[PDB]
Amino acid sequence: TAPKGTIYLTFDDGPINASIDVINVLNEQGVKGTFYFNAWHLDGIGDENEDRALEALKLALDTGHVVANHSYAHMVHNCVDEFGPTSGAECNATGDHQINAYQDPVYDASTFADNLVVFERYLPNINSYPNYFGEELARLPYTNGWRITKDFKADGLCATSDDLKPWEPGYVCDLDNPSNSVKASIEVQNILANKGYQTHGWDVDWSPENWGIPMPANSLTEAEAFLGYVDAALNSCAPTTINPINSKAHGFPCGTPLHADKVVVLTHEFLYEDGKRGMGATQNLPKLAKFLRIAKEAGYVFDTIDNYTPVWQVGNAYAAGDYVTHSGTVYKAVTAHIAQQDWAPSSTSSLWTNADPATNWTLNVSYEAGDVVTYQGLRYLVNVPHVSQADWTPNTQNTLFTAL
Amino acid sequence: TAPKGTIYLTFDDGPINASIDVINVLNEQGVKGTFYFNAWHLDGIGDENEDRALEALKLALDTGHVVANHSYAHMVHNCVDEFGPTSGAECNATGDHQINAYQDPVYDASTFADNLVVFERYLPNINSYPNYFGEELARLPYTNGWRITKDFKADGLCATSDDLKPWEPGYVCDLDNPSNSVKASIEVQNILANKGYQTHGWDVDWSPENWGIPMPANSLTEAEAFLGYVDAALNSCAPTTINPINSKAHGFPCGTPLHADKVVVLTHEFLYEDGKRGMGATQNLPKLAKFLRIAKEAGYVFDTIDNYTPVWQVGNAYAAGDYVTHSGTVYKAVTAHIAQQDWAPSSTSSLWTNADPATNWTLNVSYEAGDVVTYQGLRYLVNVPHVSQADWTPNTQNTLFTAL
Ligand SMILES: N[C@@H]1[C@@H](O)[C@H](O[C@@H]2O[C@H](CO)[C@@H](O)[C@H](O)[C@H]2N)[C@@H](CO)O[C@H]1O
Ligand SMILES: N[C@@H]1[C@@H](O)[C@H](O[C@@H]2O[C@H](CO)[C@@H](O)[C@H](O)[C@H]2N)[C@@H](CO)O[C@H]1O
Ligand code: NA
Ligand code: NA
Ligand code: NA
Ligand SMILES: [Zn+2]
Ligand SMILES: [Zn+2]
């Protein structure tokens, strides 16, 4: 039979000492999580208890959890005048993380690439792990932004600010004229998508109601009530209805088939530590353990973000319009069929089209009039719907494409 | 009909101002070259005439030449105590480029990843260029090393040194006990291969007889005499017989099918500039232009390294054992057949096995007894020949694999 739904438990801002305790709680019940890591904790400059950060990274990989890319230093270089070893402490003293969080999108996007270099430096064999998805799965700091398929995208238009924090008096978000930081974050999403990343936001956040609350670890919802929030998010387009306003994923395609019967849960392992943020270990590690227990007894199953878009499999039946990933690339089924080993999705497959959320011109993509592609550094408008092929390059096809 | 052979003209250490004059000569005669670029010239710290480096990079891409990865700063960080903007000038003052050229293989390999970040900084849309192969084609500084297929590899065992330069008295190369710098460069080769790179060395070097001659540009071999060198290299396992000793590709499999009827030429654009190395532009640009003409008159065709391993193409006939690349991955044909659009190589194809030069455990690879794979940070010996599949991971198949 079918589960009540699939929960994707995701943890942000590790690897830190508290990651080990969270992972041990997950391992007690065989639950796998997705960990969006910032490698500056491996360098010891992240202003957390992080001397065991490498142990935490190895533990996550060794016990089956998925490691994803959250950028090297959580955009904290944009929080200070000059980024250095004390920048995390100074941004924590001001609490200005959300202010000017994105500035130069090209440089900001490159800190996701920097993240992978540092991962490999501390763990040279990391790409021999099948659950290392640092190059293919990402999540933008502070931003409930999504890049899943060509027709499944969303952006947090109030995620970050140019001046006032979202919990401060006088804060106003204008959806028609978003902050400069939000507009830069959108460009970061598009740059990552063009490098083959998918980015995932969240439906529910196990966190303080807002990040201005003092001692945030103490105000986490109890496990039973949180399962109630998970229930309420199932098939309800929660990314658009979530509060507060800086957590919303604007433009999220409500009812899109890939999100059916799924809830992505966000939390942070630094909320599960007894320390500067409260009694997180004493209070919240038992909450996490109880939540896993009652969710599984209620009929939920837990899975990792790498399976959010199902991996193509020999012998599976696919309807027209079904989405899969094959070798990390998103494809959509052209015709209903049963997959066989020789009919894997490809750039010349007649059974699939590439449906990556990228915008570079790509082979075997079902383009629509109004789409904009980039090719040889030039942007082109699609005039006529068609499936791209090798000889229909934008620069030679004036009927299909118009250079901007 | 078939040509006498295929010449791959490859240029190292650009982009510099002289790259433009070289490209213009190539374009005048309809020839495409492969350029192994170091992006520190874009940052203006490469100690060359490079104020037009970005113009050179754009010209290479805009006129159809292939751009490949030669690392950010040509391993010059290993030539000085502290790498900075003057490091290129300092290493030029000592000429110690080959001494300790490789030290920390993990960091040295990561300068190939840094190279891409810098390329994307100066040219944010570079990934929209089909002839941009920075993420898939590489060449190690100073090193005639090859990573082509699972069964086509080679290493320059005398390429770099721990103390004495290869032309100095007292220099001894022990093929059984290579230098620490050479052993690091071998690991760099393996790191790049596990990231999906191929690395290409060279058959013949249009260069001074050895580095160390004072004016390296004015003495470049005349075009007719250099065509003779190409004639001698054709099908003669030139990478193993080439001089001097630091240019040899030891372990190069003589007679390997992918190298049949091909000659890879190495040269440097800085040899084609009127400047500190002599009158390279006045004297060597006509040599290059004449060489292109007489080589074609002799029956040679020119191609780029992205076609060295032929790209899989619908309608092409393939014999069993034929090698192709498909979406950047090397495959070997299982059985003779004509390629169809729905029958492309893949990780589950019955017509092809993966033949990448990588050593991580990989799907659809024809493993032999005695092979060693890396999986989940552990190394495994292959006990029994078999074609890998998703269900046969090393940690679950104690008959097929034995952990070391
Ligand atoms: N999802 C973010 C959340 O990460 C963030 O929490 C901060 O993260 C910083 C980086 O790890 C850390 O230095 C700081 O102490 C945390 N409070 C909050 C608040 O900025 O915003 C959420 O959107
Ligand atoms: N193939 C190398 C060749 O690149 C190298 O030439 C030096 O390259 C440096 C990097 O651009 C440059 O700064 C220096 O001026 C060049 N002499 C020679 C000698 O090191 O070795 C060849 O193997
Ligand atoms: Na992808
Ligand atoms: Na997937
Ligand atoms: Na490759
Ligand atoms: Zn975060
Ligand atoms: Zn070089």
CA distances from A183 to A100, A151, A162, B153 (A): 11, 20, 11, 47
- Token pair, residue A235, equals 């098939």
Mark yes or no for CB contact A342/B348 under 8 Å: yes
| A93 CB burial (10 A radius; 0-12, 13-18, 19+) | exposed
Question: Which secondary structure element, helix H or strand E, spans residue A12, and what is its range?
Answer: strand A5-12
Closest partner CB to A128 (pick from B62, B117, B377) = B377
Query: What is the position in ligand 1's atom list of the atom closest to the CA of A268?
Result: 4
Q: What is the DSSP letter of A221?
A: P
Please report how the helices A105-122 and A180-194 are oriented relative to each other, as an axis angle in degrees rounded to 10.
Answer: 50
- Under DSSP, is residue B327 helix (H, G, I), strand (E, B) or coil? coil
Nearest Cα to B239, choosing from B376, B146, B131, B375?
Answer: B146
**Could you give the angle at the alpha carbon of A241 between the alpha carbons of A97 and A32, nearest 5°?**
70
Residue A288 near residue A268 (C-beta atoms within 8 A): no
Q: Which ligand is nearest to the CA of B192?
A: 5
Number of A–B residue contacts, CB under 8 Å: 104
How many residues are listed for chain A in this entry?
A: 404
- Tell me which long-range contacts B39-44 makes (C-beta under 8 A, separation of at least 24): B39/B72, B39/B114, B39/B115, B39/B118, B39/B119, B39/B122, B40/B72, B40/B73, B40/B74, B40/B76, B40/B88, B40/B118, B41/B14, B41/B15, B41/B16, B42/B15, B42/B118, B42/B119, B42/B122, B43/B85, B43/B118, B44/B85
Is B348 an 8 Å CB contact of chain A?
Answer: yes
Where would I find the H helices in B53-179?
53-62, 87-94, 105-122
What is the amino acid identity at position A43?
D
Q: Are B227 and B297 in contact (CB under 8 A)?
A: no
Separation between Cα atoms, residue B64 and residue B347, nearest integer Å? 31
CA B74 to ligand 2: nearest atom: 10
Buried b (16+ CB within 10 A) or exposed e, B15-54: bbbbbbbbbebbeeeebbbbbbbbbbbbbebbbbbbebbe
Resolution in A: 2.1
Which residues, numbered 56 to 85 in chain B, qualify as contacts with chain A under a Cβ-Cβ cut-off of 8 Å?
A: 61-62
And the tokens for B191?
A: 């790191």
The neighbour count for residue A296, using CB atoms within 10 Å, is: 16
Q: Are strands A366-367 and A386-387 parallel, antiparallel or unpaired?
A: antiparallel
Contacts of B225 (CB under 8 A, 6+ apart): none
Amino acid of residue B40: W
Would the CB atoms of B349 and A344 count as touching at under 8 Å? yes
Backbone angles phi, psi at B307, to 5 degrees: -105, 0
Q: How many Å apart are CA A357 and CA A69, to the nearest integer?
A: 17
Contact B46, B57 (CB under 8 A): no
Q: What CATH code would you report for A317-403?
A: 2.10.10.90
Deposited experimental method: X-ray
Phi, psi (deg, nearest 5) at residue A251: 80, 5
Q: Which of A66, A307, A342 to mutate to test the interface with B (most CBs of B within 10 A)?
A: A342
The answer to whether the annotation marks B386 as part of a ligand binding site is: no
Annotated binding site of A for Zn(2+): 12-13, 70, 74
- The domain ranges of chain A are 5-307, 317-403
Name residues whose C-beta falls within 8 Å of residue A334's C-beta, 6 or more positions apart in sequence: A320, A350, A351, A352, A353
| Distance between CA atoms of residues B310 and A203, nearest Å | 46
**Local structure of residue B222 (DSSP, 8 states):** P
Between CA B34 and CA B98 the distance in angstroms is: 23
**Can you tell me which residue has the tokens 């679950």?**
B396
CA–CA gap between residue B160 and residue B186 (Å, rounded): 11
> What is the rounded distance in angstroms from the CA atom of residue A144 to the CA atom of residue A124?
31
Decide whether any atom of ligand 1 lies within 6 Å of the A97 Cβ.
yes
What is the number of H-type helices and E-type strands within chain B? 8, 22
Phi, psi of A43 (to 5 degrees): -80, -5
Q: Which of residues 362-401 of A touch B (CB under 8 A)?
A: 374-378
Q: What contacts B401, CB < 8 A, 6 or more positions away?
A: B373, B380, B381, B382, B383, B394, B395
Contact check, Cβ <8 Å, A106/B120: yes
Protein residues whose CB sits closer than 6 Å to any atom of ligand 2: B 12-13, 47, 74, 88, 92, 97-98, 142, 211
Task: Determine, for residues B128 and A347 on separate chains, whether the beta-carbon distance falls below 8 Å.
Answer: no
Q: Is some CB atom of chain A closer than 8 A to the CB atom of B123?
A: yes
Residues sharing a CB contact under 8 Å with residue B147, sequence separation 6 or more, in sequence order? B153, B189, B190, B192, B193, B197, B198, B199, B357
CB-nearest to B121 from A110, A351, A377 is A110
CATH number of A5-307: 3.20.20.370
User: DSSP letters of A25-92?
Assistant: HHHHTT---EEEE-GGGTTT-SSSS-TTHHHHHHHHHHTTPEEEE--SSTTGGGGSSS-STTHHHHHH
Structure tokens that stand for A192 in this block: 């990552």
Whole-number Å distance between alpha carbons of B359 and B191: 9
One-letter amino acid of B375: Y
| CA of B38 vs chain A CAs: smallest distance (Å) | 18
The answer to whether the beta carbons of residues A258 and A330 sit under 8 Å apart is no
Give the DSSP letter of residue B310: P
- Protein residue with least CA distance to atom 21, ligand 2: B142
User: Which residue lies with its CA nearest to atom 18 of ligand 1?
Assistant: A211
For residue B116, the distance in angstroms to the closest alpha carbon of chain A comes to 9
Q: Do the annotations mark residue B70 as ligand-binding?
A: yes
Tell me if domain B5-307 and domain B317-403 are identical in fold.
Answer: no
In B219-375, beta strands by DSSP E = 262-268, 274-275, 278-279, 300-303, 317-318, 323-326, 329-333, 337-338, 352-354, 366-367, 372-375
Phi and psi for A61 in degrees, rounded to 5? -70, -40
- Nearest chain A CA: its distance from B155 CA (Å): 21
C-beta atoms of A344 and B343 within 8 A: no
Task: Please give the radius of gyration of chain B, using alpha carbons only, rounded to the nearest integer.
Answer: 21
Taking a C-beta distance cutoff of 8 angstroms, is the pair A363, B313 a contact?
Answer: no
**How far apart are alpha carbons B64 and B131 in whole angstroms?**
6
Which residue, B215, B228, B197, is CA-closest to B68? B197
Q: Report yes or no: B210 at the A interface, CB cutoff 8 Å.
A: no
Q: Which of A53, A73, A123, A130 is nearest to A304 (CA)?
A: A130
Range B353-365 burial, b when 16+ CB lie within 10 A, else e: bbbbbbbbbbbbb
Does the beta carbon of A117 lie under 8 angstroms from any beta carbon of chain B? Answer: yes
Q: Is B311 helix (H, G, I), strand (E, B) or coil?
A: strand
Cβ contact (<8 Å) for B106 and A113? no
Interaxial angle between packed helices A223-233 and A280-297, expressed in degrees from 0 to 180 and rounded to the nearest 10: 50
Helices (H), B98-173: 105-122
Rounded Cα–Cα distance for residues A316 and A310 (Å): 11
Q: Could you say which ligand is closest to the alpha carbon of residue B143?
A: 2
The number of residues in chain B equals 404
